[PDB]
Each structure stands twice: as structure tokens, then as C-alpha cells.
């Protein structure tokens, strides 16, 4: 770097394990020089709910409100609301940009999931068509750092929960592919809570020395044999 | 039936194809003589993120906040947010579950993935041990009736967005089987924005025309294989 990276993160408490994750992520990018933005979402009050109030002025058929088309030309006509201008900006201008959360029922925490609906509309990530490798965030990086409660055991194909893989099919696939976005490696770091002092300790080190060359990784082949085949 | 039913509808527009979807669930299930509530989750205004507001009382641990541990205790002692019991009371009552909305991101909008985090606590929907077939919602039915913007074909298998059970199994597997219900075959109405005024008429009956024999119904085997394949 000669890089900028946005962390979107989503953790309500900066002691906890996703914190110093996000933290770490912050020095080590910091000391190699890279340009660094954190959305701290919860401390955004950050709003998830897609609503008629993300178009300022005047919407384009008042009578039937359709999300959809309303954001798409709101976007070209720079009309929608600030908080999603200001992470649409971030996003712009970033080389990578980390998602850092725990698994919240096999996705990503509400809050989240509303920054991906809110700041990727049509107009700005992706067109119709013009979407998966001719999407309009072709050239950026996203990873996925993700802490679970379920073990690695629990997440293997014939465990419980089935491999992690499966549950990273809509953000990897189709969320960031479907931008354009090509796809890092995802972080998993398994079960947390009841890892002791060390071990945690030791899952923090893992991805500061990993982010210490991640520039120089290729990104995954985000296709359905990657995450479901042999 | 006999029954009971709770619909949780995410969508801004009462004039929408999703609307349609719900109102004739509405009707088809009331004719049939079922007791039926809606949650309109935007008309609600329903809270998507997982705060420490959810808890009203004397926190567990006040100095490092820890959501799931703070709403498990919360639900114990009673002292959740009444927006999340009376969801739970809700869910508690119903015999089946038919969650309604439009396709975000293959996954669900931010506003229901919010829903999902904050009324299925533990101690309410599962515990641990208690989930999968042990969850606590066992007995209870579940059914995702999703639209999507993708047409059909475009969710195959060897199709851009891969076969639809693909981005199912989050919803099915990781929430509703987790939490012990049996789970109904979706209703996915395919790209009812492309259609024809005729086919959208079409897509609605045949939901109307399916829930008159729903309670015949078998669940899916919610599985890797039946998601996956091979
Ligand atoms: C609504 C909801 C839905 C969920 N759904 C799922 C799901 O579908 N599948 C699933 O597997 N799990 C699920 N979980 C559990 C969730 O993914 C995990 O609880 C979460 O990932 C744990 O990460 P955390 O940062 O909150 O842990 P924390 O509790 O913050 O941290 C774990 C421990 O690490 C300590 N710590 C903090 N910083 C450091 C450091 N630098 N070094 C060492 N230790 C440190 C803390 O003191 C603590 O003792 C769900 C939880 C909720 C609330
Ligand atoms: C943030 C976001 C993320 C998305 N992510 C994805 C994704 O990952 N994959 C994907 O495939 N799609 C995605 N979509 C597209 C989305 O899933 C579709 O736009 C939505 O499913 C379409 O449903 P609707 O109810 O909004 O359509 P509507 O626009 O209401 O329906 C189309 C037409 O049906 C008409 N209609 C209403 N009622 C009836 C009736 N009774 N009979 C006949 N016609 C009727 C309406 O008047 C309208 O003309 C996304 C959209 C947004 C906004
Ligand atoms: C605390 N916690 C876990 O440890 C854990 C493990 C798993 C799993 N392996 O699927 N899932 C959950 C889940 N859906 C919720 Cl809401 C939760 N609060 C929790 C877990
Ligand atoms: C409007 N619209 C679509 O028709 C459509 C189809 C597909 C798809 N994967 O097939 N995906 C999307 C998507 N991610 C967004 Cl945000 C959206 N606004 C939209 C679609
Ligand atoms: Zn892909
Ligand atoms: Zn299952």
C-alpha cells in the first residue's frame, strides 16, 4: 500500500473478540502505510431499514413505491440520503474493503445486511445487466472476517452445520461477486467463546501476520464448485 | 385447520407482487377458517439491529456487552424489549410460520434478517443443548414464499446465480431447522417485475391454489444433500 481499505464493521462492544480483530486490522494496515476507514456501524446508529427515506426530495412515482428503481434513480440523479452517499464514497475509493462481524443465523448481523442493501444500488455497484464479472465495482477486493459460535467441527460437511463454505454462497457469491467484486479468502475464526486466553490470543496473531501479506493473494474462484463441489 | 398462522411480510408497498402474495394467504387461509396475524414489518417500523436497548434490566456483565449472553438472561428474567416478546408470543401461538418477501442479496431484507436475530433468542427458539431437531420451535411448521428479481432459469444450476436451494440454506438449515421447526417447500414466484400482468395473476392463484391443501403438505428433508445435491 499505496492501497486504501473501508472496514465495514458490525460489533457492539470494542472489548470483544470481533473489537480487536477490527483493531488489529487497523494497526497492522496502519504500519504498512495503507490509507484506512473504519464504518463502525453500530456506532453509526447506522440505519438497515430500506425505506422511501433514502430518496431525498421527490420520488419518481409517488403512488407505488418501488425500492428498487426509486434508489437506482435517486443514485443517478444524486439524490439519495447522505449516510448512504458517505459509505458509497468509501467504497469508491477503496482498494479492499474487510467485512468484520460474528455469524448472525448463518449470515451477517441485520445491521449489516442493511449497509449491503442500502449502499450497494443499482447505478453504483452493479447495472441491469451489467452485473457478476460486468459489475461496476470490477478491480476492488472484499474478505469476509467472520467469528462463529459453532466449532470447526460443527462446520464440516457431514457436521451439524454443514461446511462453512455453504453459508458464504450469498455474500461471497452472490453479494460481492455480483458486484464485480473479486474475492479474498474468507477469515473464519471458530468459536471464540470458549477458547481460552491464549488461543484467542493466538487467533488475533493468525490474521495480523495473514493481513501482513495480503496484497500479495489471489482471490478465490467464486463459483458454485468452489463452495459446494470436489 | 384448526390452526393457527403468522405471516412475517417484509415489503414498503401494500400494492406490490409480495403484498399480493400476502394478501391472498390472508384470504385463502381465512376462508379455510385458520386464525391468521400478519407482522408488517415495515409498517411496524420493526427494529433490525441487535442493541443493548433489547434489555431493559440490570445487565449480566456491564462492562463487556455480549448480546446473545445479555438476551438469553433477558428472556429468562423477562426483561427483553416488549417489541421482541410480543413477536415471540406471536410465533409461540402459531402453528405455521410463512415468512413473505422480496429476495435481498439471497437472503432475506435487513429488516426480517432482524427479526431473525433479535426474536429467535436463546432460551426462546433453542438452547444449547436444544436446536436442530432438539430446538425449541419443534412441532411448529415453516415456509419461505420468496420473489426474486432473477428469472428461474438464472437460478440453475449452471445458470449465473446457481439452483435457488442454493441461497436457501441459511434460511431453511442455519434458522428455521436450527430452531426445531419442519420445514415446508418454499414458493418462489420468479421475477414478477419481467412478467406479464397475466403470469403475475398466474404466480399468485398458484400460491392460493397451494395453500388450499397446505396442511396435507410433508416437510423438506432440510439437509445438505436435499440443498447441495450428489
Ligand atoms: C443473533 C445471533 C445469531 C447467531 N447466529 C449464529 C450462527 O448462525 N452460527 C453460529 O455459529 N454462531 C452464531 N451466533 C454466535 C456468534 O457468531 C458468536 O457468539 C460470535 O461470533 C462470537 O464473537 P464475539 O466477538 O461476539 O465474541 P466475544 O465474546 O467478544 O469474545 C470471546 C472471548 O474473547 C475475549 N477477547 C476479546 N479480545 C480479545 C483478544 N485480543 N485476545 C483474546 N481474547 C479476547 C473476550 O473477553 C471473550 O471472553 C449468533 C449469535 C447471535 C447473538
Ligand atoms: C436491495 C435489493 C436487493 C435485491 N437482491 C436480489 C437478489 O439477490 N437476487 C434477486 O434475484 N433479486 C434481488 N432483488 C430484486 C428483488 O428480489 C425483486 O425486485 C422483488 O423480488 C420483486 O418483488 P416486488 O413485490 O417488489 O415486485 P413488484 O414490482 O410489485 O411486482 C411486479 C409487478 O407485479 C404487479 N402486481 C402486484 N400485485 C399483483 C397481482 N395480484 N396480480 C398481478 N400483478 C401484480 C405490480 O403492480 C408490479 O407491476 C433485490 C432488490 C433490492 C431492492
Ligand atoms: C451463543 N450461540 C452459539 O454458541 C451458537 C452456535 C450456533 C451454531 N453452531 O449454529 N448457532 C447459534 C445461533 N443461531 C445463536 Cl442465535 C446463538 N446465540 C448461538 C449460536
Ligand atoms: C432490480 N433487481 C433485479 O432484477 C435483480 C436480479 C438479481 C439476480 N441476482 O438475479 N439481483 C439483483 C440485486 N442483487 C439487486 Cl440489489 C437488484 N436491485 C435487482 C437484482
Ligand atoms: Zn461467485
Ligand atoms: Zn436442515
Redesign the interface.
Known amino acids: 500500500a499505496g492501497k486504501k481499505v473501508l472496514i465495514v464493521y458490525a460489533h457492539?462492544?470494542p472489548?470483544?473478540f470481533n473489537g480487536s480483530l477490527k483493531n488489529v486490522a487497523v494497526d497492522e494496515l496502519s504500519r504498512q502505510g495503507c490509507t484506512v476507514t473504519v464504518s463502525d456501524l453500530?456506532a453509526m446508529?447506522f440505519e438497515?431499514?430500506?425505506?422511501?427515506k433514502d430518496i431525498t426530495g421527490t420520488l419518481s412515482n409517488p403512488?407505488?413505491?418501488?425500492?428498487?428503481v426509486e434508489t437506482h434513480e435517486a443514485y443517478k440523479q444524486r439524490s439519495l440520503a447522505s449516510d448512504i452517499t458517505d459509505e458509497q464514497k468509501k467504497v469508491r475509493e477503496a482498494d479492499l474493503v474487510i467485512f468484520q462481524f460474528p455469524l448472525?443465523?448463518?449470515?451477517?448481523?441485520?445491521?449489516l445486511?442493511?449497509w449491503?442493501?442500502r449502499v450497494?444500488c443499482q447505478g453504483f455497484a452493479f447495472d441491469?445487466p451489467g452485473?457478476?464479472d460486468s459489475g461496476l465495482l470490477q478491480g476492488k477486493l472484499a474478505l469476509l472476517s467472520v467469528t462463529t459460535?459453532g466449532t470447526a467441527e460443527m462446520y464440516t460437511?457431514?457436521g451439524?452445520?454443514?461446511?462453512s463454505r455453504?453459508?458464504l454462497?450469498?455474500?461471497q457469491?452472490?453479494?460481492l461477486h455480483?458486484c464485480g467484486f473479486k474475492v479474498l479468502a474468507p477469515q473464519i475464526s471458530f468459536a471464540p467463546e470458549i477458547a481460552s486466553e491464549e488461543e484467542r490470543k493466538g487467533m488475533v496473531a493468525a490474521w495480523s501476520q495473514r493481513l501482513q501479506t495480503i496484497w500479495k493473494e489471489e482471490p478465490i474462484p467464486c463459483t458454485?464448485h468452489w463452495?459446494?463441489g470436489?
Chains 1, 2 share one sequence.
Do not use: C
Open positions: 457492539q462492544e472489548k470483544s453500530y446508529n438497515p431499514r430500506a425505506t422511501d403512488e407505488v413505491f418501488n425500492y428498487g448472525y443465523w448463518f449470515s451477517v448481523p441485520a445491521i445486511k442493511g449491503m442493501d450497494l441491469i452485473f457478476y459460535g460437511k457431514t451439524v452445520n454443514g461446511d455453504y453459508f454462497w450469498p455474500l457469491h452472490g453479494t455480483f458454485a463452495h459446494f470436489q
